[PDB]
Amino acid sequence: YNVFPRTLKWSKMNLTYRIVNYTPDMTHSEVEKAFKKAFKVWSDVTPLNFTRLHDGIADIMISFGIKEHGDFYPFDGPSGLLAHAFPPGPNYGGDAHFDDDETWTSSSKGYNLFLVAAHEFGHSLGLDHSKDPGALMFPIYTYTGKSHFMLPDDDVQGIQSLYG
Numbered sequence: 547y548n549v550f551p552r553t554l555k556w557s558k559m560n561l562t563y564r565i566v567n568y569t570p571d572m573t574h575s576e577v578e579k580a581f582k583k584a585f586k587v588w589s590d591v592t593p594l595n596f597t598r599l600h601d602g603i604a605d606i607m608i609s610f611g612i613k614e615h616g617d618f619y620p621f622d623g624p625s626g627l628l629a630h631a632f633p634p635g636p637n638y639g640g641d642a643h644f645d646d647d648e649t650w651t652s653s654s655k656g657y658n659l660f661l662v663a664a665h666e667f668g669h670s671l672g673l674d675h676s677k678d679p680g681a682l683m684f685p686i687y688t689y690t691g692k693s694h695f696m697l698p699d700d701d702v703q704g705i706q707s708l709y710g
């Protein structure tokens with residue numbers, strides 16, 4: 547017989563993702579680069595690896611949508627809800643949805659896709675929101691004045707509690 551694990555996390559270290567569609571705001575290449583950077587955030591702090599697929603069913607299915615887009619978490623136009631992701635599991639588990647009513651960028655203007663993706667992929671891996679206002683996993687997007695992205699201890703401790 548078998549039983550479910552209590553804590554939601556991936557039991558395999560080699561995970562796949564697929565970009566199902568693309569925002570108009572950035573080139574295919576720029577969108578791909580943002581998501582790869584966002585996954586490297588987590589692979590640098592865990593034994594996890596991420597591989598992009600060009601078709602078929604991946605562990606993490608990434609898509610852009612607006613308002614109602616096929617789940618219980620409709621988007622709300624510009625600002626407010628930027629994105630959401632499902633915790634580890636089969637079916638929709640891991641999937642990440644991005645609101646295409648946002649202005650997506652690779653800069654400090656609008657909403658930085660890499661930064662939002664890095665946060666949402668945290669959710670894809672099993673993290674909940676942080677109560678720490680400086681954490682990656684704090685719920686409210688807060689672009690800081692730092693030159694480079696650095697993962698805070700809060701988020702590192704959270705992800706380590708799941709993946710070691």
Ligand SMILES: Cc1cc(-c2ncn(C[C@H]3CC[C@H](C(=O)O)CC3)n2)cc(C(=O)NCc2ccc(F)cc2)n1
Binds near residue numbers: 629658680687693694
């Ligand atoms: C650890 C952390 C860092 C930053 C932040 N803001 C500017 N930076 C500098 C980076 C420079 C290189 C940029 C580059 O590589 O282009 C990406 C940003 N880092 C912002 C947040 C943050 O806003 N956290 C909460 C949050 C994030 C996303 C989200 F959707 C909802 C909440 N968290």
Ligand SMILES: [Ca+2]
Binds near residue numbers: 605607
């Ligand atoms: Ca999935």
Ligand SMILES: [Ca+2]
Binds near residue numbers: 623625627628645647
């Ligand atoms: Ca929104």
Ligand SMILES: [Ca+2]
Binds near residue numbers: 571650
């Ligand atoms: Ca848009």
Ligand SMILES: [Zn+2]
Binds near residue numbers: 615616619630
């Ligand atoms: Zn959704």
Ligand SMILES: [Zn+2]
Binds near residue numbers: 665666
């Ligand atoms: Zn979140």
